[PDB]
Symmetry: D2
Subunit: 186 residues, 4 copies
């Protein structure tokens, strides 16, 4: 048994000039409408020619409290990142929210340097802005005409990276261990 909010379902129905009465075999109460499982809701979605996802758009409960959400150091997800055989990053999630799933804010420790081989990613859809909280960071990316570029970012410097530009952050000084903040969004 799968419940869908009644007002929401009625709104979808109204996009097709319909009402609950035009659905075959559904029970409902004053706030919900009930389906005999996912296959049943899938069939109703085909009947309305609306993809299944729409039946859930907006229907997840907000994880904010009073318009805001707070996270604490080490309070959430954390993970090492190893590329080819090279320890490259420690990813720590900052605050994350279902009210903007495209926002991924991270604190990273950098573990590689010039003595290890380069491990560029393939770029990604998200824009990114990085701020250096500590140390000295070697940044490398693939620029115009596939030519490799590099620079060095010191504490308090920052960088914006256009979507799908491949990039790497490493320690400028080998054995030193820098920290950056990275916000992907939009």
């Amino acid at each position: 048994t799968l419940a869908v909010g009644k007002a929401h379902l009625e709104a979808l129905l109204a996009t097709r000039k319909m009402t609950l009465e035009h659905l075959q075999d559904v029970r409902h109460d004053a706030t919900q409408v009930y389906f005999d499982g996912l296959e049943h809701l899938q069939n109703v979605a085909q009947y309305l020619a609306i993809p299944l996802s729409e039946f859930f758009v907006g229907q997840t409960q907000s994880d904010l409290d009073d318009g805001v959400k707070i996270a604490r150091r080490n309070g959430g997800f954390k993970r090492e990142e190893i590329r080819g055989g090279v320890h490259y990053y420690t990813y720590e999630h900052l605050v994350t929210t279902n009210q903007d799933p495209g926002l991924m804010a991270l604190r990273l420790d950098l573990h590689s340097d010039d003595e290890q081989p380069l491990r560029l990613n393939g770029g990604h859809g998200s824009r990114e802005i990085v701020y250096v909280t500590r140390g000295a960071v070697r940044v490398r990316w693939v620029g115009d005409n596939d030519e490799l570029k590099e620079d060095v970012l010191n504490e308090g410097d920052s960088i914006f990276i256009l979507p799908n530009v491949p990039h790497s952050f490493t320690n400028h000084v080998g054995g030193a261990k820098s920290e950056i903040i990275a916000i992907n969004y939009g």
Copy 2:
């Protein structure tokens, strides 16, 4: 058992810097990942802080054939519309597709006129464009400062209606029976 496409789920996981390994309680094959029901996929969504709807976005099978979908006169949904005892419209769905659930294209017969009372709707989120295929149509709507407006649209005339502007289409002549095409979108 609920299957989610593997490449899609892996893409969502990557927006959180995760991989299948960070969900330990899931089986998978070369193209799908399997959940013990909706409650299970809902828990994984809360863990990822991504709303459930995202796990279905794009995952409904397209109802198009070779990039296109065709509908036939009288082939689909059709309904009379009666407002406070007044026969106002016949709604006939034109082609509808799950590849744009926000598109509602209609053919309407108009059945009311000046001898019946006015039955405006409450407006709606969709933009609308209407084209008169046949006859002469009295259009009325609520304009600036809630003042009622009216005009007449002849064959081949058209009108654009901003979202949430309440409106009514009726026969200008009375006993004459006009036809319009109405496209709500976006």
Copy 3:
């Protein structure tokens, strides 16, 4: 050469950078507008703010609607013949157009070609399209899966939806008959 920009709007752009009019010294203004000596001047201000020039005009065009609506009349607006490789294919008549949705292009078309003339598919387009047949019998052809050419026939009151970038052609099924369709591109 003088370029006016709405003052409230410019001030809102300035506030996205934590600035005020005072951080641009070389500008005259009234209670509602701010004036630039020319485009090069506004361009420099845009560079200084790291905001593209287009933003200075976003939202600033006066609505062409009257009381939330806009009406167009048969033959009241733009109209044009479409000839493809020497083949007279379409007559395009604009239905209502509005600056409040520039991506909405609603057309009435006459079809002038048929099976005796060569095929003239377009290259497809970004817009979604829905077509409704007002009159006659219409041969529709498009490029489907694996670049295979597809075809069908649409009668009066039939309709079709076309996914973005699917190449397509509408012609007369019968030949010498002359059909009419309504085509709405949007989004």
Copy 4:
């Protein structure tokens, strides 16, 4: 004289099923099209029923260098913020780009505390995420039913703020001087 890129103008013209030939008295080159001033381009835009802004979309030269843009500490705009006589913030712009004018990344020094009066902003359209680089930060905001809320954010904590929620960041301790990073976006 206003020049507009020719390929671009042609693409706009094609959205209206037009070509350069349908425009009255315009000169052009192999790459540009020329207008007798803004009023002229404004009239062409009314004729096409396309807002003026569209004629410049994409037409500003990117301020990125090879897909990236770098800013240095103290390299760009910087300003003190005083609210009703109270020194509240030092705003330092981090990297800014014309490729995303909705991104405003700041480094702030906090100068106020509990001994000074509260100076909330009015909120803003942008979402915000804040990360505490140094110290201990008193955050206050207006939540549900206009009730004032407060909390304390330590080094490495972060917060997400929904659009138009009014807020203030100040020093928790008093005479201590904290630092935050604040990213408004989207």
